[PDB]
Design a protein around this ligand. Structure first.
Ligand SMILES: Cc1ccc(N2CCN(C)CC2)cc1C(=O)NC1(c2ccc3c4c(cccc24)CC3)CC1
Ligand SMILES: [Zn+2]
Ligand SMILES: [Zn+2]
Length: 313
């Protein structure tokens, strides 16, 4: 009447720790908060089928929170719980291959996640947290459920809430290795003069104003010095740039961009689709694929590939 089984506990699914569990007590009474493949089992009692299975638990000793910080690059005590709660849902999403890319069937307002996912497969990016590197590898392969859950946890967003593609990519770039990325800008006035600026990291591969890359290089008008100065790109060193602006009708031409985010609807309650440039223009809407030779639509982000740009101005 006091049976026991052997199981593994973990915080990272890479270091496993053998545990003997009393089948006469719940998991929470022995481990605290405890999860099996996302599902919360803190209040469940052991079952014969759990022998050998692996269980996530919360970092409750020093060894365990070293392993957790080293895999996730966060000390936030709630992070594991949110990741498990998210994963409990995303493991039931469907991740079809669509035009050679892993996508996500629409559920729970996950259009923005799909668009992020599709984009990440088209640009050169190296994540620092091993959790993101391993899940991304899995995602690329076709099984994105851990990756999607990790994004929600890194972003403090829950299943079913629509999020912002630009903001999500900004959170993720903040965990990617962009050290060697450099942008150089110049702002010129008719009255005042040249005021050069330099940026690095995620700020050198992002923008919030215009959706065109040529316009940025040519110049754009922006405000205290005088009135409406011009801002233009002097130098860019990075594998990609991301040009964003509030959604507006916009024409996309094959060969002149890598991919982009179409947004239809109102602020914070709309719908994203993902436009990619391959041999023709494709539109990937979760699990649905359409082709066109041209495109006119409400676009709010555009990714261009890059290596090194130097102005002639
Ligand atoms: C879908 C969504 C989810 C969450 C958010 N949160 C998250 C938290 N953040 C502090 C603020 C905004 C925005 C959008 C959104 O809809 N983002 C877009 C956007 C859509 C529509 C409009 C935008 C405007 C300015 C800027 C962005 C706009 C004016 C009208 C589609 C790109
Ligand atoms: Zn001025
Ligand atoms: Zn490149």
């Amino acid at each position: 009447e006091v049976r026991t089984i052997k199981v593994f506990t973990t915080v990272d699914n890479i270091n496993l720790h053998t545990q003997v569990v009393d089948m006469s007590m719940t998991y929470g009474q022995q481990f605290g908060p405890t999860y099996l493949d996302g599902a919360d089992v803190t209040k469940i009692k052991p079952h014969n089928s759990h022998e050998g299975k692996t269980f996530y638990v919360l970092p409750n000793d020093d060894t365990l929170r070293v392993e957790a910080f080293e895999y996730y690059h966060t000390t936030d005590p709630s992070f594991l719980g949110r990741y498990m709660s998210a994963l409990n849902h995303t493991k039931k999403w469907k991740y079809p291959q669509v035009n050679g890319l892993t996508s996500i069937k629409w559920a729970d307002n996950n259009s923005y996640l799909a668009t992020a996912l599709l984009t990440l497969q088209q640009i050169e990016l190296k994540f620092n947290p091993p959790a993101l590197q391993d899940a991304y590898y899995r995602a690329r392969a076709g099984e994105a459920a851990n990756f999607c859950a990790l994004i929600l946890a890194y972003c403090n967003k829950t299943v079913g809430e629509l999020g912002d593609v630009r903001e999500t990519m900004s959170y993720l770039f903040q965990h990617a290795n962009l050290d060697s990325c450099k942008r150089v800008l110049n702002v010129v006035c008719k009255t005042c003069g040249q005021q050069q600026t330099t940026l690095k990291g995620v700020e050198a591969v992002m923008y919030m104003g215009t959706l065109s890359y040529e316009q940025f290089k040519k110049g754009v008008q922006i405000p205290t010095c005088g009135k409406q100065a011009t801002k233009y790109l002097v130098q860019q060193e990075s594998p990609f740039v991301m040009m964003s602006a509030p959604p507006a009708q916009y024409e996309l031409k094959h060969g002149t961009f890598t991919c982009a985010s179409e947004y239809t609807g109102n602020y914070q309650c709309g719908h994203y689709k993902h436009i990619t440039s391959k041999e023709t223009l494709y539109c990937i809407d979760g699990a649905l694929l359409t082709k066109s030779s041209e495109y006119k639509g409400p676009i709010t982000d555009v990714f261009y590939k890059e290596n090194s740009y130097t102005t002639t101005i």
